[PDB]
Ligand SMILES: CCCCCCCCCCCCCCCCCC(=O)OC[C@H](COP(=O)([O-])OCC(O)COP(=O)([O-])OC[C@@H](COC(=O)CCCCCCCCCCCCCCCCC)OC(=O)CCCCCCCCCCCCCCCCC)OC(=O)CCCCCCCCCCCCCCCCC
């Protein structure tokens with residue numbers, strides 16, 4: 505459907521086998537599906553058609569809010585409260601966006617596991633790798649900031665990580 | 679005594695002439711309203727102690743209580759504002775006069791400042 509992006513929420517093309525009966529007995533599932541279509545599907549479809557027809561008469565729109573980029577805590581001077589506040593708010597919004605990214609990847613993983621069913625171990629290796637990478641990056645960024653997390657604390661953690669990486673690289677090149 | 683003995687201080691002067699250059703408190707100052715509330719409470723306590731109807735008796739007495747409290751509160755607010763303004767003025771003058779004691783400092787961003795990170799686990 506056009507409600508969601510098929511690229512953001514991937515789904516393999518469905519392959520439903522054609523029915524090839526081998527008995528002269530009737531199909532109770534087929535009969536019950538026909539009865540369900542005649543008793544439930546058509547009434548709910550008519551009701552939804554009327555509701556959508558009512559909706560189309562008073563059509564109106566809502567928008568997606570856009571935020572421009574602002575200087576971050578690295579650019580903010582020491583004890584500059586206005587810039588610090590702006591950077592903290594931007595960092596919090598980006599944190600929420602990253603959380604939703606991790607949620608999207610996790611939902612993709614769950615859906616692929618359920619879809620593949622009995623052979624999920626092999627067929628879902630692609631989605632497990634993406635989740636592994638995303639979770640590793642997210643954990644490295646926001647692992648142990650604490651209850652009173654802040655952009656300053658995350659920046660300090662990144663500085664510590666960069667210092668450790670630089671020391672390791674210098675030791676390797678030595 | 680911090681501000682006592684300040685140069686040019688006239689003894690026993692509640693409000694000097696230099697206080698006239700400051701913005702007077704507005705008549706609707708919340709501090710003045712609280713002073714009037716204190717006056718009203720004083721009138722109510724007067725009625726209660728003298729065993730009169732608390733809200734009804736002595737309307738003139740309650741009015742005089744409120745008016746006196748508002749008057750003294752207005753003058754007290756004027757003096758308080760003048761003293762705080764004088765303190766700030768003297769502090770700024772001293773900061774201007776002692777740049778060696780109050781020097782400007784180089785401002786370095788958090789990208790340059792190294793702060794230790796304490797993990798919570
Ligand atoms: C305004 C409402 C209250 C707000 C309170 C906020 C804080 C400020 C307090 C100011 C108090 C002023 C009055 C003090 C004396 C009261 C005496 C009394 O009994 O009065 C009864 C009197 C009515 O009864 P009554 O038959 O006339 O009284 C005859 C006998 O006195 C009847 O007495 P009795 O001979 O039958 O003896 C019985 C009673 C006699 O004893 C009493 O009734 C107690 C009298 C002293 C109470 C404390 C006075 C204030 C001290 C400072 C409070 C600090 C509060 C904050 C700190 C935390 C709490 C402590 O003794 C006992 O019950 C003994 C057992 C209990 C003892 C332990 C508790 C004692 C009080 C502790 C709490 C104190 C704070 C709350 C005070 C509330 C006072 C109404 O009630 C009032 O007058 C209440 C105030 C009415 C104000 C009306 C204003 C005009 C209309 C509304 C306009 C609103 C604004 C509109 C704006 C524009 C809109 C368009």
Ligand SMILES: CCCCCCCCCCCCCCCCC[C@@H](O)O[C@H](CO[C@H](O)CCCCCCCCCCCCCCC)COP(=O)(O)OCC[N+](C)(C)C
Nearest residue numbers: 679681682683687688689690691692693713750751754757
């Ligand atoms: C709530 C507690 C009780 C408050 C009631 C206090 C009553 C004070 C009695 C005098 C009040 C009116 C005085 C007005 C005329 C006299 C003014 C002048 O003579 O005195 C001034 C000084 O007096 C006071 O400034 C005026 C009275 C101030 C009282 C304010 C009480 C603040 C308490 C905080 C709670 C607020 C309560 C609000 C309701 C009162 C200037 O004299 P000065 O030579 O320069 O001071 C010498 C003192 N030195 C040496 C230490 C410097």
Ligand SMILES: CCCCCCCCCCCC(=O)OC[C@H](COP(=O)([O-])O)OC(=O)CCCCCCCCCCC
Nearest residue numbers: 720736738739740741742743744745746747748749750751
């Ligand atoms: C100024 C020139 C005008 C003419 C001269 C006037 C002189 C002074 C006025 C006299 C007041 C008066 O006679 O009546 C006082 C009334 C109630 O009278 P009473 O029956 O309680 O004795 O009400 C009172 O009791 C007053 C209550 C006030 C108590 C004190 C309040 C203090 C204010 C500041 C406190 C911080």
